[model samples]
Target: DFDFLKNLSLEELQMRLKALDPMMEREIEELRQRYTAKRQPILDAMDAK
Candidate 1:
């Protein structure tokens, strides 16, 4: 499934990683709001860092 990765150069990969930051940060912020101290036990059960 990852065969397309072989054609990607390091520079292109780095660019894609940078592009992912905005979406990643948005999702992280959403998760933060959803998983406050009250959810810490569930997070710990899920082995979340």
Candidate 2:
């Protein structure tokens, strides 16, 4: 199971995600928009099927 506290803590999560690629910071705004736009529909479609 996932720990929501660990995963949802922006500081901690950003540290992990930023470690994957330093460019992540530069892409943060766009990434947030993209995820916000697509994530729910993706989840809804998966749950629907």
Candidate 3:
């Protein structure tokens, strides 16, 4: 819930959102790397054909 939003000032809210942007990218990259690692074995098997 956004119920905690009211507790933050506007500037703090903006700062928090800005912080989340980098965090979002970091998490996305982590997931991407994990998927790439998992998919690599399958890709290698396919390429062997």
Best by TM-score: 3
Candidate 2 local Cα displacement, residue 36, angstroms: 2.1
Clashes of each: 0, 0, 0
For model 1, how does the per-residue alpha-carbon lDDT over 1-49 read when each residue is reduced to its tens digit? 5677788899988887798899999999988987687687887889964
TM-score of 2: 0.31
Per-prediction TM-score: 0.44, 0.31, 0.67
Which runs of model 2 end up more than 4 angstroms from their true locations? 1-30
Please say which candidate is ahead in TM-score: 1 or 2.
1
Compare candidates 1 and 3 on lDDT and give the better one.
3
Which stretch of 10 consecutive residues in model 2 shows the poorest summed lDDT?
A: 1-10
lDDT of 1 at 24: 92
Worst 10 residues of 1 by lDDT: 34-43
| lDDT per residue (tens digit) for residues 1-49 in model 2 | 5567554877888776667676766599788988888888988899999
Span of 10 residues, lowest total lDDT, candidate 3: 1-10
Identify the runs in model 3 with alpha carbons over 4 angstroms from their true place. Answer: 1-9
Give candidate 1 misplaced runs (Cα > 4 Å): 35-49
What are the per-residue Cα lDDT tens digits for candidate 3 across 6-49? 97899998898899889999999999999999999999999999
Q: lDDT of each structure?
A: 0.83, 0.77, 0.93
